[PDB]
Amino acid sequence: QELILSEENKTNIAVLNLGTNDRRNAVLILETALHLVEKYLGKIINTSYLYETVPNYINELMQNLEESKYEENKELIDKCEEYETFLKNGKVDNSILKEVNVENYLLECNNIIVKNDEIMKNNLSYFYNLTVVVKTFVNDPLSMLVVIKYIEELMKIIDIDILFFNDFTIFMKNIKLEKNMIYKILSKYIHLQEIINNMVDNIEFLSIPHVYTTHRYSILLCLNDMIPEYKHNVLNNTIRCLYNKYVSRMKEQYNINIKENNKRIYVLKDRISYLKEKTNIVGILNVNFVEPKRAVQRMFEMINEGASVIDIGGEKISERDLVVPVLQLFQKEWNDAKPIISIDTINYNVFKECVDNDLVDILNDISACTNNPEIIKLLKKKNKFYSVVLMHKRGNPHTMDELTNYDNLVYDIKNYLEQRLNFLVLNGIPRYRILFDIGLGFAKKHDQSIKLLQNIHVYDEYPLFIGYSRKRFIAHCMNDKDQLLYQKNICGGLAIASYSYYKKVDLIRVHDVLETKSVLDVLTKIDQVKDPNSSSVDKLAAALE
Amino acid sequence: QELILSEENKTNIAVLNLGTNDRRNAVLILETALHLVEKYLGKIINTSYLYETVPVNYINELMQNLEESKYEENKELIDKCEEYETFLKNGKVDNSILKEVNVENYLLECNNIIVKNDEISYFYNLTVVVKTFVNDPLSMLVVIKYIEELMKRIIDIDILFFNDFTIFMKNIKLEKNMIYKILSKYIHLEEIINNMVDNIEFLSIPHVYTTHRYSILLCLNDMIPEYKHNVLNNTIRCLYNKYVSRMKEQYNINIKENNKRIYVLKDRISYLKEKTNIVGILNVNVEPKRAVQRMFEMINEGASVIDIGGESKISERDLVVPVLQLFQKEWNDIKNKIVKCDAKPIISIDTINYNVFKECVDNDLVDILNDISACTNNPEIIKLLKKKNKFYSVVLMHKRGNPHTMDELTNYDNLVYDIKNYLEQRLNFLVLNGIPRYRILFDIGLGFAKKHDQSIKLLQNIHVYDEYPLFIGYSRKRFIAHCMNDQLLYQKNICGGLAIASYSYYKKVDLIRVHDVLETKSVLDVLTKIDQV
Numbered sequence A: 001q002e003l004i005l006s007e008e009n010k011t012n013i014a015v016l017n018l019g020t021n022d023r024r025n026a027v028l029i030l031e032t033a034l035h036l037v038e039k040y041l042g043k044i045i046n047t048s049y050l051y052e053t054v055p056n057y058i059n060e061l062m063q064n065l066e067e068s069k070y071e072e073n074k075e076l077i078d079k080c081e082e083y084e085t086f087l088k089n090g091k092v093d094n095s096i097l098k099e100v101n102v103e104n105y106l107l108e109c110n111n112i113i114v115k116n117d118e119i120m121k122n123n124l125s126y127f128y129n130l131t132v133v134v135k136t137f138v139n140d141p142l143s144m145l146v147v148i149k150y151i152e153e154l155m156k157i158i159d160i161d162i163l164f165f166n167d168f169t170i171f172m173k174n175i176k177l178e179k180n181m182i183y184k185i186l187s188k189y190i191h192l193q194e195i196i197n198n199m200v201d202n203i204e205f206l207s208i209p210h211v212y213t214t215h216r217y218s219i220l221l222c223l224n225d226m227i228p229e230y231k232h233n234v235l236n237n238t239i240r241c242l243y244n245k246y247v248s249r250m251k252e253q254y255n256i257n258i259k260e261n262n263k264r265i266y267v268l269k270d271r272i273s274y275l276k277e278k279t280n281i282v283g284i285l286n287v288n289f290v291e292p293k294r295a296v297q298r299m300f301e302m303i304n305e306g307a308s309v310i311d312i313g314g315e316k317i318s319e320r321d322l323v324v325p326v327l328q329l330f331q332k333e334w335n336d337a338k339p340i341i342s343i344d345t346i347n348y349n350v351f352k353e354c355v356d357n358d359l360v361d362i363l364n365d366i367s368a369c370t371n372n373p374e375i376i377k378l379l380k381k382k383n384k385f386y387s388v389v390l391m392h393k394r395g396n397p398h399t400m401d402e403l404t405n406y407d408n409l410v411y412d413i414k415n416y417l418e419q420r421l422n423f424l425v426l427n428g429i430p431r432y433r434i435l436f437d438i439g440l441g442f443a444k445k446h447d448q449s450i451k452l453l454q455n456i457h458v459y460d461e462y463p464l465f466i467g468y469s470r471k472r473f474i475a476h477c478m479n480d481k482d483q484l485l486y487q488k489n490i491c492g493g494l495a496i497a498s499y500s501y502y503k504k505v506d507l508i509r510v511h512d513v514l515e516t517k518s519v520l521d522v523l524t525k526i527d528q529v530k531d532p533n534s535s536s537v538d539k540l541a542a543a544l545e
Numbered sequence B: 001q002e003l004i005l006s007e008e009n010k011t012n013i014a015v016l017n018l019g020t021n022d023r024r025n026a027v028l029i030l031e032t033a034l035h036l037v038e039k040y041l042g043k044i045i046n047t048s049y050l051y052e053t054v055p056v057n058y059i060n061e062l063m064q065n066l067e068e069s070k071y072e073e074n075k076e077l078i079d080k081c082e083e084y085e086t087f088l089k090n091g092k093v094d095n096s097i098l099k100e101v102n103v104e105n106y107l108l109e110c111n112n113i114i115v116k117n118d119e120i121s122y123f124y125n126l127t128v129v130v131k132t133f134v135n136d137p138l139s140m141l142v143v144i145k146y147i148e149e150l151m152k153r154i155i156d157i158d159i160l161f162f163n164d165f166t167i168f169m170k171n172i173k174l175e176k177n178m179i180y181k182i183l184s185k186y187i188h189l190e191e192i193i194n195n196m197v198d199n200i201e202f203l204s205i206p207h208v209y210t211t212h213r214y215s216i217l218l219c220l221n222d223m224i225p226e227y228k229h230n231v232l233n234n235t236i237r238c239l240y241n242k243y244v245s246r247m248k249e250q251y252n253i254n255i256k257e258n259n260k261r262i263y264v265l266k267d268r269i270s271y272l273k274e275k276t277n278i279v280g281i282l283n284v285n286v287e288p289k290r291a292v293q294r295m296f297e298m299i300n301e302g303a304s305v306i307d308i309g310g311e312s313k314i315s316e317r318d319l320v321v322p323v324l325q326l327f328q329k330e331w332n333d334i335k336n337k338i339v340k341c342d343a344k345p346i347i348s349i350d351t352i353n354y355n356v357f358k359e360c361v362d363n364d365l366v367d368i369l370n371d372i373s374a375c376t377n378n379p380e381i382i383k384l385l386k387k388k389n390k391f392y393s394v395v396l397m398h399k400r401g402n403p404h405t406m407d408e409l410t411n412y413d414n415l416v417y418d419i420k421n422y423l424e425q426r427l428n429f430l431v432l433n434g435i436p437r438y439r440i441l442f443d444i445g446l447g448f449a450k451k452h453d454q455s456i457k458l459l460q461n462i463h464v465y466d467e468y469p470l471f472i473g474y475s476r477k478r479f480i481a482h483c484m485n486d487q488l489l490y491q492k493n494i495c496g497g498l499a500i501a502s503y504s505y506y507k508k509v510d511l512i513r514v515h516d517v518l519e520t521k522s523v524l525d526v527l528t529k530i531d532q533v
């Protein structure tokens, strides 16, 4: 029916998929896609990691944008009843369009697949995937597909698909819609040329769940980040059981590791970083009757020495007055290879200032955003996203050394950080921008800092940032005296940089950049093997000769 | 009962097993057995590593009161041993004077003994090959039992092979005069005979347990892996391999974890691959007191070994000896603490020159020879590695040319293995000349006739020394710099080295030779601590 045009206010759970081919810009494309979804369909309440897979224009686009009909609510939530119901597949409101049963949908899907498996063989590459969950006002899959496709076309590089829409098992075989009919929907949601019309030659049909959901690995990989316990009526198993069977088959039947080709990504500023492929040095700038010029020159010194990131903090004279001048002075000389800037603050107003004057890229929040959850709001703009380091601790520096009793040290801390991540994600922080920090020395005995490093592998799936530099637990490892201990303590840290390099820790926050960079260069050199076969080829040549 | 004493000058090959249950004194004991073997039986021309398996004052006096052998000692270096070659390819030497038995009878007689035994606790094991002038295995067992007595539980010396012979003699009784007559043939005798008559009951060749005890196969595999006696189903290597795998399949044990290969730096046991020791460099190349306080400094900073050299107008000798004399004297003053009596570093001398090493060794100034020419410059130096009651350990390093030419001598058909096999044959030459295998350390010689990429490649492929005692020197060498992207370069070099310390720690390198002892010690403590669960 034409119920489609009713303002009768409802909320649906819509799982999307976003794709692109530009490697140099995948972030800029895909995050822009996100904003539009946030602006035109409802609220992003889950994302996956950004994955790489093998199977000036936009600046002015944001200035000239149409207002949405519905209003953008930036308020923090801690639960979403709709999402909760979606996941268990309990009853949400009935489907607008007609629903096809299990067996019909199953066969009509084989139709589209073999018809494409035929085309592809007669037709004789980088893929950047990213699932999303939307809490949507939009009334039905088709209405969404329309808006989705108008969104796509506004951006012309990008392919946005619906993967799920509530429990709905919808297959529609032949679809066409009028040119004014399209305008009517696009006006139900947007306050409104040679790009509108185009949609009619497309929009040939509508499959929910999307046809290739179970079939393309990259999809099942993203959905495993978000909704692994999900079991759609169509599907024989949960997202995770499906995902896990797919992987143990590509292994047993192809003798090939699928994760070697499809690579999890995280983002510090705007560029791609492959999870576990490099240990970035994050140089510490601790501002301490303060020559800002010294500080800004130390920033340059550290850049030269090898730092990919600068972590500034001051933690009477206020913190704001200790760091903003410096960042402004720095921002200037750079306009007279650019290092990513991290601010070590828990203070909302200081980050806001820094973020409004574009002086920083990452928030380093040692309270894991629990001092002031509102700070999470500052990591979003219309067209901007900032990344964040969440660190574990207990108490403050006066009391933390005594707050040391844990039911399960390793897993308590990991779960803690996992719940924070979920919280930020549930609030539209992109999963791939959230970095984990175990907080060495913060409410841990020395043995516990070590036990934490010993068990750092529990972070294999996640972007990891750690700070050991110059901490007391290093001294605990050892078997003019004050000068020795500071020589010993820096060298001890160098051992942890080595350990970190082998454990593939993504970022290490250090005082001594020169030193750490030397260590990491030698270790990288040793690992850079020109022929990965040579050891056994050369072994055999010697047995033969 | 007297063809055993026939005047016929003979040269046989014998394989011996040496065992003791004393851990604290394993080295001292087994090496004393080795001295007596060299003195009374012939020439040691092969040895295995020393192993720890799982199934003291009088020795010094003993050494001053030993009857002379009647047979010549000859320390000259040799390059080949024809008898040993024959033994290896199962060729026939002279015919046995003891009556042989055939394979069937041998095997049957062996099983009985092993059954009669299944019917009826740390071990230190070592095998030896002896080019022996002793006429026959029974005669040899007599001399061996005398040796065992001279040393007395603390030592068991068994014969494992003797030429190609297969022998099983039950119910032996040697009349007590017969023993004296045998011992007299080989020794200038000047009480304990009566013990030996009761104890020689039978004679088995091969030894019954040769092929049945893991630790024995373990030792023989180091020495004679390709050997196949008539009585054996396979070569020593195959038999060894099949024993290892039977244990993980039929029993799921993995026997390698119960049995540890050992090397020896000075006089104590080290377990191969269990610790990365720091060797602190002392280049005198100046003032004797400044150098000795630097030695003491390095001890405090964590060095287990000090490596002193005067090479890279005034003799090498004059640079190192006085420093070593002073250090030795000062160390004797600061022995008021007897907690600082067993905390003495092992002293290593970095020299290729015989005169310098000779003086050090005569004056008990050093423990280890660090020969950067792998004893090729003057192999006579190999004689100085053996005294009557002492063995010295040695580092063998690969290089080409000399300091001016080495940077040009850089072509290798197969870098990693060329160097590996080179070191392996140097070791074969030393072992052939009676140096215990477990006292020989391998060093790839980083930076000596290697381009920086070749130095790296050697470090990338360091796993090829997994079975061997490994000593490396990366410290402050040019190639570290080739890795980076004036005092800054100094600093970068030290820090780059500490990366290699890390790598060496994980690769379980046995000794690393460093200038920066304190820094290195700090890195290794931290990595060690992260490893303690």
Ligand SMILES: Nc1ncnc2c1ncn2[C@@H]1O[C@H](COP(=O)(O)OP(=O)(O)OP(=O)(O)O)[C@@H](O)[C@H]1O
Binding pocket: A145, A159, A160, A161, A162, A163, A201, A202, A203, A204, A205, A206, A207, A208, A209, A210, A211
């Ligand atoms: N659930 C769905 N979501 C999006 N499009 C759908 C869905 N079901 C059917 N379609 C149809 O697919 C077309 C979407 O175009 P799209 O850009 O995704 O093609 P594509 O990029 O070639 O897809 P693929 O890469 O899977 O071949 C529309 O014409 C629409 O009718």
Ligand SMILES: Nc1ncnc2c1ncn2[C@@H]1O[C@H](COP(=O)(O)OP(=O)(O)OP(=O)(O)O)[C@@H](O)[C@H]1O
Binding pocket: B141, B156, B157, B158, B159, B160, B199, B200, B201, B202, B203, B204, B205, B206, B207, B208
């Ligand atoms: N090849 C051989 N080497 C040494 N002894 C042998 C050999 N063949 C037979 N024997 C006999 O074995 C006995 C040697 O006793 P030995 O001290 O080796 O026993 P053990 O120390 O208890 O060790 P094990 O019982 O394992 O042989 C002597 O009776 C000797 O006659």
Ligand SMILES: Nc1nc2nccnc2c(=O)[nH]1
Binding pocket: A344, A364, A365, A366, A389, A391, A437, A439, A440, A465, A466, A467, A468, A509
């Ligand atoms: N993220 C982070 N920030 C820090 N700031 C100060 C000291 N340590 C740390 C630390 O360990 N992690």
Ligand SMILES: Nc1nc2nccnc2c(=O)[nH]1
Binding pocket: B350, B370, B372, B395, B397, B443, B445, B446, B471, B472, B473, B474, B513
């Ligand atoms: N064994 C050994 N000795 C050395 N002496 C001087 C310089 N380097 C070295 C070295 O690398 N190894």
Ligand SMILES: [Ca+2]
Binding pocket: A037, A038, A039, A040, A041, A042, A043, A044, A071, A072, A073
């Ligand atoms: Ca929204």
Ligand SMILES: [Ca+2]
Binding pocket: B037, B038, B039, B040, B042, B043, B044, B072, B073, B074
């Ligand atoms: Ca001899």
Ligand SMILES: [Mg+2]
Binding pocket: A159, A160, A161
């Ligand atoms: Mg598509």
Ligand SMILES: [Mg+2]
Binding pocket: B156, B157, B158
């Ligand atoms: Mg015995």
